[model samples]
Target chain A: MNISQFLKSLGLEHLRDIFETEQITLDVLADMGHEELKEIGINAYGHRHKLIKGVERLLG
Target chain B: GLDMNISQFLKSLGLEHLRDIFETEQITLDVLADMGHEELKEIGINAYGHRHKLIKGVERLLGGQ
Candidate 1:
């Protein structure tokens, strides 16, 4: 999956809108921080972790 | 760049199952590289061998920098 679909793949489809609006590309995702996710409204702790794991694959 | 997150790096060290505690504690790669022995202990990595292995992995991540 690409970046947008990748978000959904992690059950984070809801946050894709904000991600796109914020212009989060693969490069941004590769080094994205946990707090960054929180700043973008992903308040749930585990969801932030899920995005981190997706980032692992993004760089892979 | 560091290849992956701290938990995945730890997994590569063969010291798996640290994900939960690490996630809760908000560990980072640099923290792994610089955290003292007590820091690792406080984060629940109680085994001396596990600490040694993680330290070695962090060294490699630093790549002689």
Candidate 2:
């Protein structure tokens, strides 16, 4: 008999470690390089909130 | 250029209130992460850090003068 083991991929594993301790900062995230920057820059909820809030009232 | 555009727009908006939000904590990478491209440009002035262009870009935009 033979057995095989596999693990599923984890998405944004680094982010959890950084964000959980609130250790995530410009300097910290910077180490992740440009790809991560674009991802975080374009999609993170907390990051996006300020922008929306900043402009929303003005738009209204 | 995008950052510059946002800065110009914010200035056009006459950013009296926006200045207040940026008064503390230089623009965190978390800030750039959360905002859209246009919004990112709008507040780029506040970002700051070393060896990290994102922060520097924001600082430049913020014009730490």
Candidate 3:
């Protein structure tokens, strides 16, 4: 899936702008840890949790 | 033969809250290597970074690193 589709799957369509602004592609997402996601403004625990799980599922 | 209390060891990581969960689960350091991210999550450690750090710490302790 593309970046937009990936974000949508994570229920984070709202993050499209930030992801684009940060040039956050799937490669970057694959390497992102909790600290990196927090730096990218995903501070909410629920969002971070789902995003982490989403990334793991996507990569696996 | 590990002399450290589970609570004390977890506290060293600044995660004192996990002490109760560890006790309830009987998660002594001896069995830490058996824990994976899913198991840690099931035990209420939902933070990905925390889980990663914990797994890494366990691995280091077990000389897996």
Candidate 4:
């Protein structure tokens, strides 16, 4: 139930190392934007939207 | 005097696609060393070929230098 779990839940396991290395924990996810996600290699707009939606789903 | 990591261990066995699943499930060397075919099934792998290859990979990783 950590950041890895969060990312995997979104089928973003391929980006796990980036998120982990960047220390993007659950506490910091709610404040993220597409630009932040892009920094971690999530350049695909669809996946970025999906990730943000998931974050909002949990946080709001 | 060796460093064993799951990514390299899996990559060598041609199971690179499963690395994330392994990471998500937190599979350790000890867990993999003791993992049986049935254990893999329980872990949600339905593909028969992957099941066998993974079992063989386990054997290779632990016993194949």
- iRMS values in order, in angstroms? 6.6, 7.6, 10.9, 12.1
CAPRI class of candidate 4: incorrect
Q: What is the CA-based DockQ of model 3?
A: 0.02
Per-residue CA lDDT of model 4 for A1-60, tens digit only, reads: 577778888777887877768888877877888678777776554456556778888876
| Candidate 2 wrongly placed segments (more than 4 Å) | A1-16, A20-60, B1-5, B22-65
Q: Any runs in candidate 4 off by more than 4 Å, and if so which?
A: A1-60
lDDT of 3 by residue, B9-64 (tens): 66667778776666665466645666688868866888998888778876665673
Q: Which portions of model 1 show Cα errors greater than 4 Å?
A: A1-60
Is 3 or 4 the stronger prediction by DockQ? 4
Give lDDT: candidate 3, residue A1.
Answer: 73
Residue B30 local lDDT, model 2: 42
Give me the iRMSD of candidate 2, please: 7.6
Superposed on all Cα atoms, the candidates' RMSDs to the truth, in angstroms, are 9.2, 15.8, 11.6, 11.4
lDDT of 4 by residue, B1-65 (tens): 15778888777768889876776665666566666777677566678888888777767766856
Chain B TM-score (each prediction, in order):
0.80, 0.26, 0.74, 0.77
Candidate lDDT values, in order: 0.72, 0.40, 0.73, 0.72
Which pairs in model 1 have colliding backbones? none
Error of 2 at A31 (Å): 27
Cα lDDT tens digits for candidate 1, A4-58: 6787676668777888888888677777676787787766545666677768866
Q: Say which prediction, candidate 1 or candidate 3, comes out ahead on lDDT.
A: 3
lDDT of 2: 0.40
Which structure among the candidates has the greatest lDDT?
3
Q: Tell me the TM-score of each prediction against the true structure.
A: 0.47, 0.21, 0.47, 0.46
Ranking by DockQ: 2, 1, 4, 3
